[PDB]
Amino acid sequence: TGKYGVRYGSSLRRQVKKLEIQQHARYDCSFCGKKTVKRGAAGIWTCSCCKKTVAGGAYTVSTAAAATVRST
Amino acid sequence: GRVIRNQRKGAGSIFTSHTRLRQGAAKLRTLDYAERHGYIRGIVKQIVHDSGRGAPLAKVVFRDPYKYRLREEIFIANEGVHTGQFIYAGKKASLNVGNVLPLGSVPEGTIVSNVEEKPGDRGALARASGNYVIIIGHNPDENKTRVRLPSGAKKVISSDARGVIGVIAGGGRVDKPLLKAGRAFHKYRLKRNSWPKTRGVAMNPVDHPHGGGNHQHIGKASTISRGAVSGQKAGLIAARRTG
RNA sequence: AUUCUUGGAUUUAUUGAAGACUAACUACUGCGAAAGCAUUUGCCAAGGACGUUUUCAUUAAUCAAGAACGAAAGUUAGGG
RNA sequence: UGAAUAGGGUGAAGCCAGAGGAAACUCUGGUGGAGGCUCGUAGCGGUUUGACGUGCAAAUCGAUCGUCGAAUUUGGGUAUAG
RNA sequence: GCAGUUGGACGUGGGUUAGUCGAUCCUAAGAGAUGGGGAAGCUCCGUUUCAAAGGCCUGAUUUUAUGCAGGCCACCAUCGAAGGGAAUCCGGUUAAGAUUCCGGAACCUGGUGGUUCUUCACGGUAACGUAACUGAAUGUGGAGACGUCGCGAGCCCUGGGAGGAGUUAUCUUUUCUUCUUAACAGCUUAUCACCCGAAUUGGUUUAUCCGGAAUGGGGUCUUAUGGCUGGAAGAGGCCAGCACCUUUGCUGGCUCCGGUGCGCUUGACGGCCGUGAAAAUCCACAGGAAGGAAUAGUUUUCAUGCCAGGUCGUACUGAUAACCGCAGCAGGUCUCCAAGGUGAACAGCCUCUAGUUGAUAGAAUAAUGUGAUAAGGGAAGUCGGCAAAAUAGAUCCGUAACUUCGGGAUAAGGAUUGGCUCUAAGUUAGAACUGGUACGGACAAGGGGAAUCUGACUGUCUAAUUAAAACAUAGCAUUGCGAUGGU
RNA sequence: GCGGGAGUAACUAUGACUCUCUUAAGGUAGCCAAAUGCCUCGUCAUCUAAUUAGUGACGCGCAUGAAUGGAUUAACGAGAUUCCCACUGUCCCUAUCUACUAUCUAGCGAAACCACAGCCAAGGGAACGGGCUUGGCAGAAUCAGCGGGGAAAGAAGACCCU
RNA sequence: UGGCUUGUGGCAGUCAAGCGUUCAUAGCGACAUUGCUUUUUGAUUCUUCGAUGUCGGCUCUUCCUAUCAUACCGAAGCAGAAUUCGGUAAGCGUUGGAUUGUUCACCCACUAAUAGGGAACGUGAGCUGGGUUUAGACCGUCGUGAGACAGGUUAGUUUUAC
């Protein structure tokens, strides 16, 4: 959206910041919590604090994969 | 006519690039048959991008000397591989997302990434980002198994394959589109192929047989069959249904 | 008649998979301010009515603007 | 794979405060971050006009005109030959 | 391209002294050497197990030493940087130059003197002392290791004191100018984290945070702009005094202090994604004693003596007479350093350190081709507003359709400056006064109103007559197509 | 890939609708005199000292038509027309002054480069004569100028055919 | 291109019956032709490929009158004057703008008023390069097609010293 600029028209350029926002801010970790946990690497949501691994599948903390096998 | 652009594929200058710079794109190494509590199984180390894939990967340690110096073991990136959780393997393994293990051990309708499909290949299907296949060929499919690969088509498999359970890491190529074309050209240097393209009708019938006419149109034909030569075979290769 | 069948259909049984809906119970029934709400079980969570009372003491009624909610059909992006 | 852009103007998103509003709108200031945001030099491009063509370069010279954190420019090494 | 006392032309010889500055290992682009085969050669393949390298045990020979052969050990395997991989300052002197010769002071590479823990023996013991024999870190796990981007808080002109001179011309000793200095070691600061943990609250602050201040278990620590201290007993320097053969040669001597950048400090922190490399050497290889205080050593560090440093490039030009346009041609040509005041910077303006006008010349200065000015007119002229004119800053007022709501605005329509005094004995803005052609006075610095098209946007382009509507573009769909694909 | 011939409504004037032939069978939403129109100064309004542009429509479509797509519709340009305001050496209208050279001189020293010859009017003619026929005319030493011929500086023409 | 003829044709003499109030000739002229001529408009390969480069205009270098206007004259079916017609005679004068590439086509404002014909239309080593011989790209129209067209559109070499 910042990087995007004038490229695209109404449906795309305006609306992608509304996808970026929920991918942004620094959240709690699954096992600690200072301000660290965002999109660290691409799809890999990291932790700079106590360094701790998450397990979901693709996006954030849980996708379709962990909703099946780490559930049943 | 001259040499067509599709013939310049086997060799070429545009068909060279960095090969050994690539640290190890995502196959799978030796990882223990057993799981008699496990031998060759350990934690994830680093998160590093190999060129070719266009997605993050990882390094892994097992029982063997793997942090830096020994250059091989690269581990398939699932959300969110990092230091301080274990991987497990073996035949009759524990079914979790982020564990590499057989297709036989998982039930029907499990999503899997970095999966083999021929008799051994280390890792074939769905190595980069977004991708995954769907194993649905057990139970009334009795002996020979079958991954139903994501379009619609076939593939007979014997015993065959291991692979990580899940959907893979990333998701920001279809999920998030790009912006411009020089930033798209970063694909066509980690892959060797000509880029971009000019129209077939705009090119002369000399350089590509889709040209012809003062008022430009398609000279020969757009639909050409499967059994054909080099310059002869272009366009839509066997247009089975039009529309 | 198009159509489907001797390249074995309809079908009968067995086995496996995918989605949607919940017959009967079902009513001259109940709930929700209206739109609306049908297998069974569990969790968070709301409202009405009754009963001896206890209790703050007009705190109330109504309300243009304004704010929030919206059957179906239609539109956008990703799935099925 | 190595080297290079001084100077100068704005600022969503995130987050807080203050007046105001049944509540929301509204509305006043601070904190702060993403730019083909944007601007002028390096690097770098070629619209107009006059003089040359037995002359300085085998397409030359003067006046005049463009871009610059982006699809950026450039050196070196190395490979591809009808 | 002339003269010519001149030249790289012409001819002859000399000068360039390194462990010290370059000439290496391993990772990338990328590539090489060797043998046999697969096969028609090319070539791919093998190197990955031996190889290569290292530890432990045994036998024969010889010596101041030594060196060799056999037996035993699985835990690793291709090649090449600019980014990764030794050391250094200052003066004398030269026809020329030294981190090179040389003078003075360093450092790297080998030959002489001093011991700390696991674990163990003997003696002694709160103790500590010593003889026998002591190679030594292919890792759990962490590092060397790489997209874009933002706010801090510190880092100057000038003065003070000392020496010297009052200007060809009216006149001038608190006027101007010169002088005003110095490797290293010791001393000892911002960031981080066992202040994780967290009661509390230093830090413009939103603050969970981290600190004055308080708590554990018994409690504290690293890195480091600057400053302070040592070296320097000594050395230089504004400027003068003598010898005196009057050619030429020496000898003596001053001041020393206060207001400030874009270096470095900050990958943390803030916050986004396209998701951040690989490796040899090397770090990594797990702390005990006294509460801490305090005190010592280390397969490490201190003390001390002698020799040797390989092997060449080394002159010098490097916008050039050495490179390079056949050329003594209006040329190509990597790339280093950064003062004053005026104007943002690196425009312009103009002086320093500092340098220089080329292989022909004089006098007049037609026609014609090369520069500016002006009455009146105001587009009337020419393929052709091409050419040429209006206007311009700072600060305040005032201002148009309609939106893919990211927009248009500097639309139009108007008004004023510098200087000096005063507001306040110290940003800047408000009051007040006069004049001229005019306050931006060199330099420098927007034309506006009204109607209309196409490619969405930025982007690619015909090398000696075609810069576009050609083609790309983020994005979207059908078809090949399960990859041992399609091609 | 997406038709012809014939007949037909008060009244000038037109064909809704109907019949017939032919072929595999004959087009919607929306728009028009085009980068495409023979016919056409078509036909009408406004503008202009005339004005066909500006801008207003007419219907008289040689030959418009939905996916290598109609259609909604904002921002941006060394790209394309006109009206309107101030105005302009482009011109009217040319003059004057200035820089440098021409004139003139020294030195050394180019360039591709070699037809006997060099008047005009009339006449014949290898066909447009200074050159051949008659007639009129034509002297030399020398320098500065200027674009008319011969047709320069040059390449075996650009049209054109093998 | 030049030559030739005057095809295609222009002009005049003019046969002069008609018709204009009577009335062959104020005027109008059936029907056409003879001589001249080279203008509408072309017949012909005679003479030409080691160049035969285009149009409208600017600028400057001629001659004739198939005559617009100025000197001189005569006549009418002409009242002065308006109107209508013919002879002697080439020294001179012969506009400004708008439509249109453009003279043609076509209109206006004046003014005393705004002619005819040839000459290498002076005419690209004086000048513009709009008109005018190749090369981006598109449409209509035609052919199995690469592509083409007696149809239109968009960009696309004026060198130098006589």
- Sequence length of chain B is 243
Q: How many other CB atoms sit within 10 Å of the CB of residue B158?
A: 10
Nucleotide nearest A17 (Cα, C1'): D13
Q: Which two tokens stand for residue B29?
A: 């190494």
Whole-number Å distance, CA B179 to C1' E399? 38
> How far is it, in rounded angstroms, from Cα B33 to Cα B39?
9
- How far CA B5 is from CA of B26, B108, B226, B228, B231, in Å, comes to 31, 45, 18, 16, 9
Sorted by sequence, the CB contacts under 8 Å of residue B25 that are 6+ apart come out as: B50, B51, B52, B53, B57, B74, B127
- Contact with chain B for residue A23, Cβ under 8 A: no
Sorted by sequence, the CB contacts under 8 Å of residue B15 that are 6+ apart come out as: B9, B192, B193
* Contact (CB<8Å) A57/B56: no
SS3 sequence of A7-72: CCCHHHHCCCHHHHHHHHCCECCCCCCCCCECCCCCCCCCCCCCCCCCCCCCCCCCCHHHHHHCCC
The distance from CA B167 to its chain's CA centroid, rounded to whole angstroms, is 14
> How far is it, in rounded angstroms, from Cα A38 to Cα A36?
6
The distance from CA B129 to its chain's CA centroid, rounded to whole angstroms, is 9
- How far CA A46 is from CA of A43, A61, B65, in Å, comes to 9, 10, 25
- Sequence length of chain A is 72
Q: Which residues of chain B have a CB within 8 Å of the CB of A64?
A: 111, 167
> How far is it, in rounded angstroms, from Cα B208 to Cα B4?
6
Number of DSSP helices (H) and strands (E) in chain B, helices first: 0, 10
> How far is it, in rounded angstroms, from Cα A65 to Cα B239?
37
> How far is it, in rounded angstroms, from Cα B86 to Cα B41?
8
- Output B203-212 pairs: Cβ under 8 A, ≥24 positions apart: B205/B1, B206/B1, B206/B2, B207/B1, B207/B2, B207/B4, B207/B5, B208/B4, B208/B5, B208/B234, B209/B1, B209/B4, B209/B234, B210/B234, B210/B235
> How far is it, in rounded angstroms, from Cα B137 to Cα B165?
16
Please say whether the beta carbons of B117 and B147 come within 8 A. yes
Q: Which two tokens stand for residue B235?
A: 């366009």
Q: How many other CB atoms sit within 10 Å of the CB of residue B180?
A: 11
The distance from CA B94 to its chain's CA centroid, rounded to whole angstroms, is 26
Please say whether the beta carbons of A18 and B54 come within 8 A. no
Q: Which two tokens stand for residue B49?
A: 């991008």
- Contact with chain A for residue B133, Cβ under 8 A: no
